[PDB]
Design a protein around this ligand. Sequence first.
Ligand SMILES: OC[C@H]1C[C@@H](Nc2ncnc3ccccc23)[C@H](O)[C@@H]1O
Ligand SMILES: [Mg+2]
Length: 379
Amino acid sequence: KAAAIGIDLGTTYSCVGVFQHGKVEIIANDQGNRTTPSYVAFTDTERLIGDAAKNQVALNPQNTVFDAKRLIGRKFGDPVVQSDMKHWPFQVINDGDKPKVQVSYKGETKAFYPEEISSMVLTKMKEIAEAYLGYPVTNAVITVPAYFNDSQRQATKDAGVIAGLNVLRIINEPTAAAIAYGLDRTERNVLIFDLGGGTFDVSILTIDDGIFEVKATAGDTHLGGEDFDNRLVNHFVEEFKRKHKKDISQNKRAVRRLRTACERAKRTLSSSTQASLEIDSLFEGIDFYTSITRARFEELCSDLFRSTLEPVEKALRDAKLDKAQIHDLVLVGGSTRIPKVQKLLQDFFNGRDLNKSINPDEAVAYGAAVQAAILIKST
Ligand SMILES: OC[C@H]1C[C@@H](Nc2ncnc3ccccc23)[C@H](O)[C@@H]1O
Ligand SMILES: [Mg+2]
């Protein structure tokens, strides 16, 4: 019968997988991308989700929503909501102690609950899976951070039901990554090092007889790939001032366009030692054609890369385990593809091999897809 799917509903990107013909297929979207931005944009004529939404952000900042995972299942009074709101270009309103995102859509003011925004992202992932499978998909496993509370898990499950999905189970992101690597089929102590687009999560699990126990969680909810992009943005703003004698830092569109180029250059630096950066008419008709070296990017982010080890040390203390007691070091998130981040973690664990054979950007969806296939058999 119809296969069930695994969905990694990420803060910045989402990913969908399916276990078919004895293997996991991570499904590419219509643009050919195996991950989709967790973005929704509203225009005078349409609602855009994923790549098309992220692509037009510089020309529609107030009506392009992202980071709904930071609001989902929270009350307006939550300290996290109170702190996070100042950093977003879109409006957050308060409706009886519930946050809602307020936008302009088809020439009208509309407001959506966080679970309605995440339901739009989940509808996109469901449609990406149906385009590959060729039949309607109704069952899914959706992942969440280990630290999510009952309200945040319930709101995520509600987002799935709004999307027309029957949610077989809400499972922890680190548990899904461990399932992907077969770590439950080898007491096994696993460290999941999840450096995402906007958050950094370290989890220590103990797996015994198929049972997962969360021994410790540590990290920084405000450290991720976006922060490395911003170190490049600042460096380039300074370069533009030196070359052209113009300060672009107050031009919101120019900064946004520069940030988009920086993210692309950063990805290239994970596989090449140099990356070109080329923007046409960045400011006042001036074309900004330049380049950056991997060594310079490493210098610009040196403090941030080093800071990823403190949460690892903290999690080991909380779990009451030494480095030698950890059996597996699992990489999660595209930011773990950065060679310097891998070198720092390997050196900390005295040269040990890292589990990185599954694309780190896809490992959570991969594990969710394996678990979805196991659970649908039971129904
Ligand atoms: O989870 C979303 C994160 C991951 C980060 N992606 C990447 N960040 C760094 N190197 C990469 C190399 C290949 C592919 C992707 C790479 C992307 O730019 C974003 O910050
Ligand atoms: Mg993630």
